[PDB]
Design a protein around this nucleic acid. Structure first.
Ligand SMILES: [Ca+2]
Ligand SMILES: [Ca+2]
Length: 338
DNA sequence: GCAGAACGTCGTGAGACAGTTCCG
DNA sequence: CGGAACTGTCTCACGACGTTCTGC
């Protein structure tokens, strides 16, 4: 079972980003009495091309659960179903989990009560409540609230499985301090819900080269989960910009400029997976930018790194960035290189 | 002259299941 | 009977910026 602290932390970061912890009950037209089995799962979702990364997480989790290279729409998932695997896996992830920690504790709890709850409609209903919380915790505010417990209490009374009086508790409307696991999580989360990117900004008032290469990493999330960004922000020495809302209900945390990324990135690189290349390329740009400012020749092949980064932030089929082709044209016609 | 902050935004890349097929 | 695997998708929650807006 011995899964490494920074491997557990990364996965939790990644799960909190691109994963899902959830509970559901399945109709079972062949079960003894209670015709529902409560299903429990965690999953990791990602685009087809990044499958090796899922396959890697799989291998770390003792090769439990079922991988899927393609689920139909060029997109891949790794679902771990059942209490056998989850009672081994979740204990390892729960300490590092943040956004979905509650969901994980709930699943872990359902596991504890399931044996007894299994052939007792009273204790099954009480457990179905926990299935409700989990599905609710995965919901928005404005969304319809989970009514599995209500629909089953009605089903149990009609099927004569429960006598008076019924339960219960349901809404019945009838300097650094960035340590290994701190960085590992953040890298997990950035790999999931984050972005590492470079861009050319047109600056209509520069000495010679009228562009500046802008460098950034960002974190994106729904506004309700903003405090979690506010956490990562604090943990990174309080660098960069935060938005509680950018206008469309989704928050972001953006760290622009070599100054911050010279400090932050080296902390995340060793734990970064999906976005590690982008990270190093940014560091590389930071590394050879001083000399690149004056010389249009050194600016150009540095502008290639920008293209390369933007390329990495695309699938193979997308049209590849042409900043190098456009600036080469511009520099020739401005006589800056000939 | 320099560069970060803030604003706004296509076009997908996810989340979180519900069903349904296998399976000892 | 018991429950996990595999199929399939609807609805946003993201990404990765182009823009432009301050700030010394
Ligand atoms: Ca997410
Ligand atoms: Ca992602």
């Amino acid at each position: 079972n011995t899964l490494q602290p920074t491997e557990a932390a990364y996965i939790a970061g990644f799960l909190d980003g691109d994963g899902s912890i959830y509970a559901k009950l399945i109709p079972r037209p062949d079960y003894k009495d209670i015709k529902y089995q409560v299903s429990l799962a965690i999953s990791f979702i990602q685009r087809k091309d990044k499958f090796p990364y899922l396959q890697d997480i799989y291998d770390q989790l003792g090769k439990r659960g079922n991988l899927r290279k393609d689920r139909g729409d060029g997109i891949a998932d790794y679902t771990i179903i059942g209490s056998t695997h989850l009672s081994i896996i979740l204990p390892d992830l729960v300490p590092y989990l943040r956004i979905k920690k509650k969901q994980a504790n709930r699943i872990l709890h359902i596991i504890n009560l399931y044996p007894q709850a299994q052939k007792n409609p009273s204790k099954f209903l009480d457990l179905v409540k926990i299935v409700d919380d989990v599905q609710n915790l995965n919901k928005r505010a404005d969304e319809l609230k989970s009514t599995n417990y209500d629909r089953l209490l009605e089903e149990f009374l009609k099927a004569g499985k429960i006598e008076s009086s019924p339960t219960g508790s349901g809404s019945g409307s009838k300097k650094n301090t960035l340590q290994p696991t701190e960085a590992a999580y953040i890298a997990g989360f950035l790999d999931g819900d984050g972005s590492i990117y470079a861009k050319l900004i047109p600056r209509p008032d520069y000495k010679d080269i009228k562009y500046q290469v802008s460098l950034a990493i960002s974190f994106i999330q729904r506004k309700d989960k903003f405090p979690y960004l506010q956490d990562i922000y604090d943990q990174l020495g309080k660098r960069g910009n935060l938005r509680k809302d950018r206008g469309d209900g989704i928050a972001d945390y953006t760290i622009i400029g070599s100054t911050h990324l010279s400090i932050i990135l080296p902390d995340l690189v060793p734990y970064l997976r999906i976005k590690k290349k982008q990270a190093n390329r940014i560091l590389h740009i930071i590394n050879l930018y001083p000399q690149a400012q004056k010389n249009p020749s050194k600016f150009l092949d540095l502008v290639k790194i920008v293209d390369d980064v933007q390329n990495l932030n695309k699938r193979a089929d997308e049209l590849k960035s042409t900043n190098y082709d456009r600036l080469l044209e511009e520099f020739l016609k401005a006589g800056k290189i000939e």
